[PDB]
Amino acid sequence: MSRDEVEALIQEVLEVYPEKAKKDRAKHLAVNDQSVEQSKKCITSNKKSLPGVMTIRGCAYAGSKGVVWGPIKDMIHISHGPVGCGQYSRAGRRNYYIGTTGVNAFVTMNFTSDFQEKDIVFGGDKKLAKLIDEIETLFPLNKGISVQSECPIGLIGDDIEAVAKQKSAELGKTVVPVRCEGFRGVSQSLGHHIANDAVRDWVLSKRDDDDSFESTPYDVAIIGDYNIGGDAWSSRILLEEMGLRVVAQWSGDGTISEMELTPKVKLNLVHCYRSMNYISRHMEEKYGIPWMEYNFFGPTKTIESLRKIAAQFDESIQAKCEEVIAKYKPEWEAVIAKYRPRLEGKRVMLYVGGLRPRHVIGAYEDLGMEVVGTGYEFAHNDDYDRTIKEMGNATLLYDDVTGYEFEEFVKKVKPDLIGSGIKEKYIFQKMGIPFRQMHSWDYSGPYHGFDGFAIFARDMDMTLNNPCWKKLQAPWK
Amino acid sequence: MSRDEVEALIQEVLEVYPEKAKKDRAKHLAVNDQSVEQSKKCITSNKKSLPGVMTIRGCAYAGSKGVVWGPIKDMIHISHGPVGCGQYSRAGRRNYYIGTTGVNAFVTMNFTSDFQEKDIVFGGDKKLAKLIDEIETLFPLNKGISVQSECPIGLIGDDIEAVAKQKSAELGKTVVPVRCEGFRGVSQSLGHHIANDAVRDWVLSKRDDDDSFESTPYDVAIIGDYNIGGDAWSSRILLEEMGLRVVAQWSGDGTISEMELTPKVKLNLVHCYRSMNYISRHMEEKYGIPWMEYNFFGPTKTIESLRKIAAQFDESIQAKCEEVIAKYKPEWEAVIAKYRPRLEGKRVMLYVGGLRPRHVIGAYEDLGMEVVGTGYEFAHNDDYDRTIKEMGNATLLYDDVTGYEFEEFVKKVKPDLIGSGIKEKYIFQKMGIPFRQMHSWDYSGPYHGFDGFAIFARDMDMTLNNPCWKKLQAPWK
Amino acid sequence: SQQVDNIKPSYPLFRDEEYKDMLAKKRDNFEEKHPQEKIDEVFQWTTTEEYQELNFQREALTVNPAKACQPLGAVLCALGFEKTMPYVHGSQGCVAYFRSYFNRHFKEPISCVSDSMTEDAAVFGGQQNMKDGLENCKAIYKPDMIAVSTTCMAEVIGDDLNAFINNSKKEGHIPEEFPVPFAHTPSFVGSHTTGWDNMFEGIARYFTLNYMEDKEVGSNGKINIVPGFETYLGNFRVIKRMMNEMGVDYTLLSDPEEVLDTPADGQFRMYAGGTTQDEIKDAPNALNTLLLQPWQLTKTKKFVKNTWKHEAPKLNIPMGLEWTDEFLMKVSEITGKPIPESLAKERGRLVDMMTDSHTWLHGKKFALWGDPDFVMGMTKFLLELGCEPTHILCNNANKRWKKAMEAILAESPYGANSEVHIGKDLWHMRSLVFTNKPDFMIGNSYGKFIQRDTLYKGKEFEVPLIRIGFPIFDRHHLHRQTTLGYEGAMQILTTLVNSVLERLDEETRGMQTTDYNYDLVR
Amino acid sequence: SQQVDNIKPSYPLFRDEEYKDMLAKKRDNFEEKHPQEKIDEVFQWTTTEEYQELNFQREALTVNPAKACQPLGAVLCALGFEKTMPYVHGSQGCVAYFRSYFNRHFKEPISCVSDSMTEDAAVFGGQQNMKDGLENCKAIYKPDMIAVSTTCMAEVIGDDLNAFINNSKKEGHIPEEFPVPFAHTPSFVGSHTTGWDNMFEGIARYFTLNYMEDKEVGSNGKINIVPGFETYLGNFRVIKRMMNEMGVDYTLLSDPEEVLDTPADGQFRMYAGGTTQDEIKDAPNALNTLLLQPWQLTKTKKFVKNTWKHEAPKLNIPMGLEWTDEFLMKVSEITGKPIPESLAKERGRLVDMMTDSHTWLHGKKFALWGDPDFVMGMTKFLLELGCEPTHILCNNANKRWKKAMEAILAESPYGANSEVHIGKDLWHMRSLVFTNKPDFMIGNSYGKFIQRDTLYKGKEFEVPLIRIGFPIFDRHHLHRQTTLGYEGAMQILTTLVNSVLERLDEETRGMQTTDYNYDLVR
Ligand code: ICS
Ligand code: ICS
Ligand SMILES: [Mg+2]
Ligand SMILES: [Mg+2]
Ligand SMILES: [Mg+2]
Ligand SMILES: [Mg+2]
Ligand SMILES: [Mg+2]
């Protein structure tokens, strides 16, 4: 598909819109050129969603509660307000963890204040205070509490900060008020930021005075890995075999203790730039901890990343990096040996959130697959900057893609596979296009690391080459 | 219903028959009269079934393989012939046992010689010989084999006895031929006899010379409890509590060694007279072992039976008997206090095989229930003799009852409950009459002993007083 | 390590010794975890009577609720009308979740739009969003109707939906005659059920409130049927089956069944089937209006009595034997159509099944939860089966429903040891099933974690979950089943008794231990 | 002991410490039990490939077969005719068992008579039996036809049914024109399926062999459907539904669906529904005859070509997607009826469920057994689902069937690692599932003992049974399900994918062990 052909596609699809919307969207759709260094010359991002167009995006509550804070296993995260948000978000995100749920770990539970009318009318500050006492009685082994604010908290004028500071002093446990009301910002993005800022303000400085912890030269922390399907575990392993000691995972299988120990580390390894760039910069400025972006989808990226990580340390660690690489060499080769022939030349359209639309391209490419379109729900131009050199010439790029736009693109582009979210999945199966979940991994995974790559490859094959896709045509038609 | 009315019922049912069948059936229906001591005066039994009347009875194979032998847990019992008989009788009967099935016990398995045409046309004696070899290889922990002849074995004139003898001496293991072909006799009953005879002639003499078994004054055997739903275990515990040592059970959970040890005991305790009186007499004649009939349905019968059993022994036993009674006194009293009010005055018709039609009547009467009709598939006149004083006056009796008869009796008698077999169950439920399976115990039990009584009372009540029965009529009719 | 001929996903991958060690070291070094002994002690304590007393003293904390928020209901109601787009006026984060929640139950696409209200609307209001959103949605997705509900944001600030819609029409953003029924669906009042009823009453009003002059009760010969919030496809299907067998002319008001079950035949169909605008317009002319789930249809009931002049009969949900009987008889009474022998036979087959299975069911203790109508209907049927419903909870029910439930329980001996809990949650339910253990739970996918907790105390304490209700996310295609009518009673019975027998097989499969009772025939 | 509030049956009663104390003394003193160690040793040996090779060397011994004997099928065939009494000439033992076996599968009454041949009849044949047998049956149970089959006794002695029946008529035992179709059903040939085929051809021949001169292919404008041995009620129903949806005039020949499913409404009905004598008499005037289970209708196929002049289509059983399509297209070809949109949608719906559930079914390995047609159809469907049918066994199939199965297997990449076994039994199947362990067994109730054996080896070695086929004795009302057509495919898929997810939930319920993967959504 030429560059002009994809430009024409965009014009064709833009024809449906009232003029106001028509003018907005035009700025959010692009054909990739790889000479471009500054993304903003061809696509805008991180703007308001248009009313009535069926955006796929969510809210700042999703970005804070669902994404950043929820995974932290030894704390209780209160969905503060009416009952919907915490119900719909109960255990929909596969942020894996090791615990005794309901006793010492709480991830898959839904704690809420469950606002009634009188809580709207007369405020929920007294409710919230009472609730936190009840938590302390019924769940004594919690190691702190966050309060995830939902739409009404800010509009009725409740002062959760006041309650948090009081309760925190009275319990001897940290109590974190988070203003992640879903009216704030435009998407999940601001949620991440609000959440990173709550970490900074309320938890992270807690051991500034305390240097009881024994540090070593090889201490790291994984930042922005939410352990979807054990992804951070798939990643942790490689770093420990390389001879690093991983003090912390933010926040998949994370604990308040490890968050509090992360100021003691030597390096921060940022998998998800979008969600946790904010805290990595804070810890650079305040603690002098360097940080580096990395990529553990598929062997080419995993190998680059390991060596790039290993170079931050001495030569003992750079040796062990070559040993790890050598050990996994035959395993990833077997996976490619088997799967690439079943997948050579297949074309993929992605649509995801803030990271995976660029990050997973290498993994496809190691299986001989071409990503011919990719987009993000709530990314900023820094993300798109990093997308330029990943996607090839004359490929389709879309931001806050509308239900309409994605359908029409897929019909014209006719991909062999689509990698997106749950709201998209059942639309394209009925059209006849193999579809893989690129958020939940379709209840499979992990995909990170060497061990991940085997499962990813297996899954792309099992879905793309499945018998079901040859049968959608009734044979008497 | 008076005697007059009952005899008019019998006359009106008989009208349907053609003349020859009518003359025969008139002899197999009676109205009970407790003055009569000679049951032959009122009823004939143990005759061939009329053609085409839909008898409930089965065959000699059933009486032998199905009933007597197949429970014996550590032997392998071959169904010699075509595949049918072994498959319809596989695990159909809940003759409970302890074992590692396929390894040291074989009860619920189906071994057959599975005759094809060439096995019919040229005989199966050599298939059978090779079969016994394959058993030895594949199942070395079997402690003996029985050959259960299906219909065609007698008819094509196979000499199974010749194979039994060779393979037995060759293996050092008992191989028992059993001529239980389905055409012999008129029912299961002759199967019991042929099988009792097989025991006598091929197993029970094994330890005649051997005097190594250490006896005691208190050694007994349970003859004729096949451990339906754990029935024999319930019985067994009461005798052991009473001082006695139960050396054998025939054939529920029973073993070959237990059988071969039986001639060493002091007293034979016969539950099922019908199936195992034959061997009990042979054991009296040959070993001078006395035997007595007992009854463990309900507390009245159980208390009486326990006292009569203990009288055959010394004081120490009779004392120990009074303590078994005292100890269960509160248990069975509670069962009655709860369940008897929910059953008081309800009427029951029974139809079972050779014992239960008389045996279970006291158990009903302990719950204030009345048996208004009973009968047997295949009992003899010594059975009906024992039934006379067990049933009320002017109550209906039926031998080898026909499908048509049993339905017509039920319509006119209008009982509250029926206790019969799997071929009867689904008929009377459809008519709206509570039904309990009195062979399979409807997958419940045990019903024997004091522990079985609680269960039996629970069962009669759960079925009789079920809400399902109030709801058969559509309310708009 | 992966071997390519035995590729392991998360389970069993991380049971490898290498992974287990890594996780132990992670714990010991950095997690500063409470000791296991301490963890177990507290676990134990959570199973006690003492902890239950504390748990039931909660006034402010909610844990693991068994309800959702209104607009979830309004969305479902609106999907049930022809070529109709659900539009929630409010925050867009709301709709992402509505869509996903329903995506995961039905394994279907769920079409729904927002007008994306942000910080700015918080002061000045969402008038601008309503204008543009209505216009954009109509141009892009071409519905013949837009059904408007609200998120909490818009309720709290107080957007007048009625005025905002009129101004959107006055400025030409959408045609004046284009149908835009609306309802206020506040997430901090009632629950998704309340949302359904609000949405339904809003659509009914829109089409009939000012058009009563030319209307005569019975004039169109039909009966109207209003299902309420329903996430079983078979239930829509069985109502229509039964009315057709009876020769009864009916209009199903809100029929989401085509659109929640489109075929995979090469093309996506955003819209499919549903109640027509002519049907809802003509609906006042019906003989009468039947409410299949009456406890959740308060507002609809009032509207239909007061405006349409339908004397909507006092019918329980048609679940189980007696209440299906009453439904069909009431239809017959209203329509003059006799109940045919086909339904009589179907009835008799159900009674047949009852007789056949009653021995396995007798005195089986159930915990259950769900919506109030469903819960009341399942409770009735369990009593008909000679089962004990010991723990009955409905998070989203009132004191009137509880009293009516105790009335049902009191009529039956099998209800003598039962207790009804209203406005309680699945953390309360967790306590009950520890302190007074049933044989099974009947409930939604949220029950599995309770089942997890009970096992950990021990295998003898484990209480299996029977998945009936909403949502069900960890099994596939159960949404195609039926709980209404004889057919639904059949399906339920089968599940229940096979649940008993499956469990028994497990408890008796242990060779030489318990397998004396591992019977071939049951 | 029993406490009256908590009455224990066999399990868990026998688990009480006293019971356990007792059974152990019984063992020690009198049972001469091999060492447990010896027991475990042998058990471990029965799981090996060594044992496996010995097992498969068997030439004479059969253990745990997956088949029954001809007359079982004769009887099922006969029950499908209007007011017809099945009558088995021979010993009564056989009939006791036929009735009980069917009673336990269907949880229904089963009506069947014997003429009770005994020792006498060996010397001098069963002529007197047949005379009085027919007259008694006819007077008492008032059938409109008696369908005669045989036990192995009467086969072996050589009773001539034909002459015996005519003599009964000659001597007035029954009327001249009273229908008494007959068939020879030797238990030592083929299986119950072979018996169905024989009884069927018996009845077709009885009614049409001498009435062909006035017949005309196509004259009545119908198609004849012949089901073969079928023990799911929903298979009878689904064929009748599809033909009615197509407006296809049909005749189902042998239709036991009413009589296998009478209502419990106060009355016993020994007879219900079934093929009429007119329908069978008129059957030659059809356009053609479809054989739903061709591998078990050899004889019927021949008769229908040679006498009726219907060139019956080579259709595989209508199971799964492709073969249901081929059925419906063939009916359409023949009838000239187009396939409606309703059916296209149902098909589309199946495909959508296939797309929804494939991640879970893909690569999943199955052991399978049952009747040839069923096994072949299930195997087809599994291949369509992306499952590996590793162990495919049919006890009652020939080599021609094995080759045609190897062909189907060779056409799919999912069939690369499979092996078709004919004339083997469940003791063979047991070894197979130890040496080459699949994820599940698809089979009848007999497979539960295989599932018990795998578990003793270890939970990691356990193979859960999914019950599909005949007979099913330890669950209730599975006989109402469907396996044919799109509906049967839907139900099968549901059962498999939910069996996968159930097992997974079982392996991931372990708190702080495996429960990291105890996901709410799958
Ligand atoms: S945090 Fe973000 S939408 Fe970086 S909100 Fe979202 S578990 Fe996505 S592309 Mo769901 S910025 Fe994580 C994400 Fe990426 S929940 Fe997961 S898949 S790598
Ligand atoms: S052996 Fe007999 S038919 Fe005595 S053949 Fe039959 S397990 Fe019956 S009335 Mo089934 S003489 Fe036993 C019997 Fe009674 S199989 Fe059981 S219930 S007490
Ligand atoms: Mg998918
Ligand atoms: Mg779907
Ligand atoms: Mg025990
Ligand atoms: Mg039944
Ligand atoms: Mg999936």
Numbering used by the authors:
A (entry chain C), B (entry chain A): 4 to 480
C (entry chain D), D (entry chain B): 2 to 523
Quote the study on this structure.
Anc1B, by contrast, is composed of ancestral H-, D-, and K-subunit proteins. In addition, all ancestral proteins crystallized in space group P 212121, which differs from the space groups for the same proteins in A. vinelandii NifDK (i.e., WT; space group P 21), Clostridium pasteurianum Nif (space group P 21), and Klebsiella pneumoniae NifDK (space group C 2). All three ancestors showed anisotropic diffraction: 2.65–2.93 Å for Anc1A, 1.82–2.8 Å for Anc1B, and 1.82–2.42 Å for Anc2. Among all ancestors, RMSDs for all atom positions are largest between Anc1B and WT DDKK (0.36 Å; compared to RMSD of 0.50 Å between A. vinelandii and K. pneumoniae DDKK). This observation may be explained by the larger number of amino acid substitutions between the fully ancestral Anc1B complex and WT, whereas only the D-subunit contains substitutions in the Anc1A and Anc2 hybrid complexes. Furthermore, we observe that the position of the twofold symmetry axis relating the two DK heterodimers of a single MoFe protein shifts slightly between Anc1B and WT. The same was previously observed in VFe protein and FeFe protein and may reflect slight differences in the interface between the two copies of NifK. Additionally, two unique single-point substitutions in the ancestral K-subunit—K211N and G307N, specific to Anc1B—are likely to impact interactions with HH E111 in the ATP-bound state. Positioned centrally within the DDKK-HH interface, these substitutions alter the electrostatic surface of HH. In Anc1B, the substitution HH S177G is located near the interface with NifDK, with G307N in Anc1B NifK identified as a potential interaction partner.
Nitrogenase provides access to bioessential nitrogen via the reduction of highly inert atmospheric dinitrogen (N2) to ammonia (NH3). In all nitrogenase isozymes, H-subunits form a homodimeric reductase component (‘HH’) that transiently associates with and transfers electrons to a catalytic core. This catalytic component is a heterotetramer composed of two D- and two K-subunits (‘DDKK’ or α2β2) and contains the active site metallocluster where N2 is bound and reduced to NH3. Three previously characterized ancestral variants were targeted from phylogenetic nodes within the evolutionary lineage of Azotobacter vinelandii Nif (wild-type, ‘WT’): Anc1A, Anc1B, and Anc2.
